[PDB]
Each structure stands twice: as C-alpha cells, then as structure tokens.
Amino acid sequence: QLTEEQIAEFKEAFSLFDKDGDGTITTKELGTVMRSLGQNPTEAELQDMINEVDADGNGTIDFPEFLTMMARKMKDTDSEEEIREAFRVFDKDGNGYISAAELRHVMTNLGEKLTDEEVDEMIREADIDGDGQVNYEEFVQMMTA
C-alpha cells in the first residue's frame, strides 16, 4: 500500500518531467527529459508512452495518472529489471561502465545538487574493483544496499 511519504516521492518524480509546472506532462516535455538522459525517442514512441499512462484520453499525463502507474510499478517486486533500466540511463555510452562524468550528468539533469567530491564519494563507495567506474554488478549492490 501507499504512504503519504511515497506519494511525495512520486510527486518529486512527476515534477522533473513537468517542466513548465502546469500539472501535466506532454509528449514534448517527456521528450526533452529523455533527450537529456541520453535517449533519442521517436515522436511516436513518445505518444505511445503518453497513451499508456493517459487514463482519461486528454493526451497528457496528470499526477493521479502518473501516480497510478508508479504505484502499480512499485508492487512489481521481481524488478531487478528496473535496476537494469536505471543502469542504462546512467551508462549513456552503453559501454557497460558508469563514469564519474556520466553519473554527474544524470545527477544534474535530475536536478540533484552534488559536489564533485560527493560524486567522487558515490563512485568510490560503489566501486568494488578499483577502476574508478561503476559496472552493472557494482551498480546492483549500490542500488539495493
């Protein structure tokens, strides 16, 4: 079930996509966020994304709608699949390693303010093997720790 607390975290996630603050997410906006996360989606995969979440048919995502999707996704608890998607977002060059700069860029585009030292700290704590970078398995430990 759902805590006042999880709702508020889900609203943080909503805000990032709602660029203009008007309470809805458009295909435009989803695009700018996706583009800023490395991907380059087609005008149609974007409309398809909106359409799967858009319960009322008005062509944009509001917060109840987003909330329904996120809450439902949360009760999938066999989801090492979602950590994989999280990995892919960070690893922009698909090379199997998250660099410091990759982590920084993602980090900034989610509005998250870390210092260069903090990022260094994040990588350092996650890097089990000492190569200054985060691989898939290290990322898993990090995300589930």
Binding site: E9, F10, E12, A13, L16, F17, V33, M34, L37, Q39, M49, E52, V53, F66, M69, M70, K73, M74, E81, E82, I83, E85, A86, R88, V89, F90, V106, M107, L110, E112, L114, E118, M122, M142, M143
Partner: protein, 64 residues
C-alpha cells in the same frame, strides 16, 4: 640606396606577417574541418520508474 634599403626592410616585414597570417588562416580552417567532421561522425514505463529509483538513491546517499 638608403631609402630603397629601408623600403626593402619594410616589405620583408610585411611579407613575413603575410606568411604567418596565411598559416593562421589555414590552421583555423583545418581545425574547423576536424570539428565539423567529428560533428558529422558522432551522428517505456520502466524509464519513468528508473528516474524515480535514481532519485530515491540520491536521497539515501544524502542521508547516509
């Protein structure tokens, strides 16, 4: 001739600057053809939730 010798010096200086300037103009063009050529070479619901997991991860960190 004194005056002539003087003129010859002035033109030697002009000529050398012409040569340097032409080298700089060529370098700028090549650098730019390296760049415009680099510029022409490097050319689902789970994603929403991914974004969330990362945010969640940042919060945990800041609280660790």
């Amino acid at each position: 001739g004194t005056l002539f010798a003087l003129v010859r010096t002035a033109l030697r200086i002009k000529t050398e600057g012409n040569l340097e300037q032409a080298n700089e103009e060529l370098r700028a063009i090549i650098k730019k053809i390296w760049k415009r050529t680099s510029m022409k070479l490097l050319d689902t619901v789970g994603k929403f939730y991914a974004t969330f997991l990362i945010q969640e991860y940042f919060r945990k960190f800041k609280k660790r």
